[PDB]
Amino acid sequence: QTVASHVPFADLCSTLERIQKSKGRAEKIRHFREFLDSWRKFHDALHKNHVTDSFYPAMRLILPQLERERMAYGIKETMLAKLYIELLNLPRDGKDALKLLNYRTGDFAMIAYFVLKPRCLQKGSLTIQQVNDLLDSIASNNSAKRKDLIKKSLLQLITQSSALEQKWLIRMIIKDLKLGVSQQTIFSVFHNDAAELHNVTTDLEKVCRQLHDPSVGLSDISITLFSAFKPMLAAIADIEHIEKDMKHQSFYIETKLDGERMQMHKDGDVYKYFSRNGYNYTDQFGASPTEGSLTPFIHNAFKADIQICILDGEMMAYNPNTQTFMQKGTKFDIKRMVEDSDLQTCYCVFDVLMVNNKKLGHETLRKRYEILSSIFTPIPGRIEIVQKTQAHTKNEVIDALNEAIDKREEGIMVKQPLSIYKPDKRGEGWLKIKPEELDILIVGGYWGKGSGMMSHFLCAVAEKPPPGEKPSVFHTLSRVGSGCTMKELYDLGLKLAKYWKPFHRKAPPSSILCGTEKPEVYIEPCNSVIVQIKAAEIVPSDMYKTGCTLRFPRIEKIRDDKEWHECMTLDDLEQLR
Ligand SMILES: Nc1ncnc2c1ncn2[C@@H]1O[C@H](COP(=O)(O)OP(=O)(O)OP(=O)(O)O)[C@@H](O)[C@H]1O
C-alpha cells in the first residue's frame, strides 16, 4: 500500500498549474507546501499500522530534470504532434496540425493544451503511481528501440488524462516544468536537509525516503561510497586580482583539462563511475577489472594498501602514437576511434575524497593532494595525477596560462591549499582562469618540446601585392602551438612534411621576413596553408617582424577552403588594432 497509488495525478497537476500562474515567489511556494502537507498527513493516515513509501513518485515528476532511475524517453515533439493529429482527428493541413509539427521555441505543451482544451473533455483517471508506471514503460521501450510500445504507452497516458494533465505530462516528459521557482527553493521547502543530502547522493528517492519527517535531520551528511556526489566547481577569476583572491599566501596552479568530469568509486574488484550529473557510466569504463574500457588497465595501478577509494578527475581521449590528449571539438569521431583502439580513455585525477575507512572531504586540499600521491602509481595514458605546481606570483599565474595555451589546454586552475571539498558549490577554494579572428599563413615550424611531429608553427601576414598580383613577401607575426590535440593538425603536419626546408639565419628566404624569432624550418608560401587563429589581443613585440604579436594565440581550424594568397595583410592587421 502506497500513497501515490491513491493520489490522483490530477491533484498534482492542479498544484503545478496553481504554482505556475502565481506571480510571487511566496504564493508559488505556498501551493507546493499545501500539496506536500496533504501528502504527509495521508501517508501517516495510511501507514499508521505499517515503510519504504515516500514522496518520490511526486518529487520525480516535480523535479523531472533530477530523474535518474528512469532513462531517456526518446520522445520527439513531432511524434507527439503526429500522434495528437491522428488522435484528435485534426485536418492534417490545418493551422493546429502545422503549429504542432513545425514547433520551434508559448512552449510545446502550451500549444498542445490550447488545441486539446476545447476538444478534450475527459476528467483524468490515472494515479500518480500509474503515470509513473506508464513513464517507466516508455523509457524501457526506448532502450529496447520499440517505437510501437512507446506509441501505445503514450496512448494510455493521453486518452486517460485531462487536457491539463496532458499539458503537464508533456513538460514532465520534456523535463522542463517552467514553474518559476528554483529546485533549490523546492528542496528547502521539502526539508531543511534536502539540498545538502542531494549534493552527496544525486538521488531524489533517498532524499525523500531518508528525510520523510520534516523535523528529523541527518546529523552527518557526507560523501559515501557508491553514492554520486555533485562535483565541486570553480569560479571565474580575473588575472590582475589573483594574488588577493588566494589570500596573499601560497597556492596551487593546476592544469585545466577539457574532458568528461567523472568520479570513480572503488571497493576491491568493484567499480562505479559517475558523471557531473550523477549518471552511471560504469558500463563504459568497467565495473570489474575483467570488464570495461578503463578499469582493466588501471585496476593493477592501485597500491597494495588500497581497498577503497573515491577519486575526482577528467576522462580524456589519449592518442598513444602522438602522446596527446584529444580536444572535444574535432571533425573526427572521438567516441568511435576510442572504441576502435586508435584512441584510449585516460583518467586524469585531481582529487581523492576517501581512502579505505577514512573520509577526506574536510581535509585541506594540501592533505588530499599528499594522500593522492599514495593511492596509485600513475600509468601515462590511462590514469594520471594532473600536473600542478606551487606558486605565489601574478606573473607566475601569467606564465602558467601562456604555457597552457601554447600546449593547447583551455586554461589553468588556481586552487587554495587550505580549502576543503564542498560538493556542488562553485568557487570557495577553486578558481579557473581562461583567456580574457585572424586568417593567417604558416611560414615555418619547430620541433622539440613535443613529438617527428612539430611543437609549433611560425605564422605570418602578407604584404599587400600590386593589383593583379599574388603576395610575394610575408612578415612574421606569431609563434603558435601545433600539438595534435585535433586530428586535423595531425593531418596537416603529414601533408606539409614534404615542404619544410632548413632555415638559415645567415641566408634567409626573400618570401618570409622574420623579427628576432627564427623558425628551424620554413615553407614556400604557395606550398602552405592558412590557419584560422583565435587570440586575446594584439600586443607589442621585438620577436616578430610586425612589431607586434598575438597574446594567447590558439589555432581554431585549418582553412583549407582558403588559398595561400588569401592571407590577411599588414593592412588587415592595421585595422584590427
Ligand atoms: N584540474 C581541474 N580541476 C578541477 N576542475 C576541472 C579541472 N579541469 C577541468 N575542470 C572542470 O571543467 C570546467 C571547465 O571550464 P570551461 O567549461 O570554461 O572550459 P572548457 O575546457 O571549454 O570546458 P570543457 O572542460 O567542458 O571542455 C570547470 O567548471 C571544472 O569543473
Residue numbers in the entry: 8 to 57, 60 to 114, 123 to 453, 461 to 475, 478 to 603
In the authors' words:
DNA ligase IV (LigIV), one of three DNA ligases in higher eukaryotes, plays a central role in the repair of DNA double-strand breaks (DSBs) during nonhomologous end joining (NHEJ). Human DNA ligases have a conserved catalytic region consisting of a DNA-binding domain (DBD), a nucleotidyltransferase domain (NTD), and an OB-fold domain (OBD) (Tomkinson et al., 2006). A covalent AMP-lysine intermediate is formed with the catalytic lysine (K273) in motif I of LigIV (step 1) before the AMP is transferred to the 5′ phosphate of the DNA nick (step 2). Artemis is activated by the autophosphorylation of DNA-PKcs (Goodarzi et al., 2006). It has recently been found that Artemis (residues 485–495) also interacts with LigIV (Malu et al., 2012).
We also solved the structure of LigIV1–609 without Artemis485–495 at 2.84 Å resolution. The structures proved to be very similar except for the conformation of the loop between β11 and β12, which is distorted by the binding of thiomersal in the mercury derivative (data not shown). After we submitted our manuscript, De Ioannes et al. reported the structure of DBD of LigIV in complex with Artemis485–495 (De Ioannes et al., 2012). Comparison of the two structures indicates very similar interactions between LigIV and Artemis (the root-mean-square deviation [rmsd] of Cα atoms of the structures is 0.975 Å calculated using LSQKAB in CCP4; Kabsch, 1976). However, the rmsd of their and our structures without Artemis is 6.88 Å, which is mainly a consequence of a difference in the conformations of α2 and the region after α10. However, the conformations of α2 with and without Artemis485–495 in our structures are very similar. The difference between the two studies is probably due to the presence in our structure of NTD, which stabilizes the conformation of the region after α10 via contacts with α11, the following loop and that connecting α12 and NTD. α2 interacts with this region and its conformation is likely affected by it. In the crystals, the structure of LigIV1–609 is captured in an open conformation and probably stabilized by burying a surface of area 1,104 Å2 between OBD and NTD. In nonderivative crystals, the electron density of adenosine is clearer in the catalytic pocket of LigIV1–609 molecules. In addition, extra density near the adenosine is not explained by fitting AMP molecules, indicating that ATP may bind to LigIV1–609 molecules that are not adenylated.
